[PDB]
Amino acid sequence: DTKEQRILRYVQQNAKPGDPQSVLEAIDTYCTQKEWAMNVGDAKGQIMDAVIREYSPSLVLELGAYCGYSAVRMARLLQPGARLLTMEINPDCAAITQQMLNFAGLQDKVTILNGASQDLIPQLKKKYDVDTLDMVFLDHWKDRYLPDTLLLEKCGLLRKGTVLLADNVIVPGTPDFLAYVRGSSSFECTHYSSYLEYMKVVDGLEKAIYQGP
Ligand SMILES: O=C(NC/C=C/[C@H]1O[C@@H](n2cnc3cncnc32)[C@H](O)[C@@H]1O)c1cc([N+](=O)[O-])cc(O)c1O
Ligand SMILES: [Mg+2]
DSSP, X not given: OOHHHHHHHHHHHHSOTTOHHHHHHHXXXXXXXXXXXXXXXXXXXXXXXXXXXXXXXXXXXXXXXXXXXXXXHHHTTOOTTOEEEEEESOHHHHHHHHHHHHHHTOGGGEEEEESOHHHHGGGHHHHHTOSOOSEEXXXXXXXXXXXXXXXXXXXXXXXXXXXXXXXXXXXXXXXXXXXXHHHOTTXXXXXXXXXXXXXXXXXXXXXXXXXXX
């Protein structure tokens, strides 16, 4: 049994099927109360929601599905006909994400790609009928944000106005990517300050009274 299976099972047992908000809330409860996990969480999630609603993207690419928290978050706000493509290297995580999406009733909007982003990005146009992307959500390994951004550019997947939205630019941090985009005339950058997910960390004191030998 893995933490990620435990999260999925908690969702199946407690959330309302076909209700994306309920699925988000079950994940957040479980991770707040039982086991920390690297989902973006509700605080940053609300910022995500505001951005997605502003731009109304027709085609979104996610790097790093994990358990599908952000895929549910994003897909539930997509208009009819819009698509989310989400890349996940770990087959266990890809399976969990697909089940999470199924449970939420969002499976028709989302396509899961099993593989490493560096290998899949060059296949997007031919295999998945993609011209350019409207939005990219980066939340995979932090050292991959910059190499994959350069690869997206190389592969012709970016157009004027494509929105990159990157998690964790403060903690754990993505310093090369952040410096790059902030210094490049090819990008206009805005920072949205928030809070790291699930940080009400329990600790305690132990009192141990010696009784003699
Ligand atoms: O490390 C974090 N995220 C990495 C996310 C990784 C997820 O993306 C997949 N992946 C990785 N490169 C990939 C390339 N291609 C496809 N999937 C890939 C991994 O298999 C995992 O499912 C993180 C850590 C903390 N934290 O506080 O420690 C907080 C956060 O919010 C985080 O996002
Ligand atoms: Mg993250």
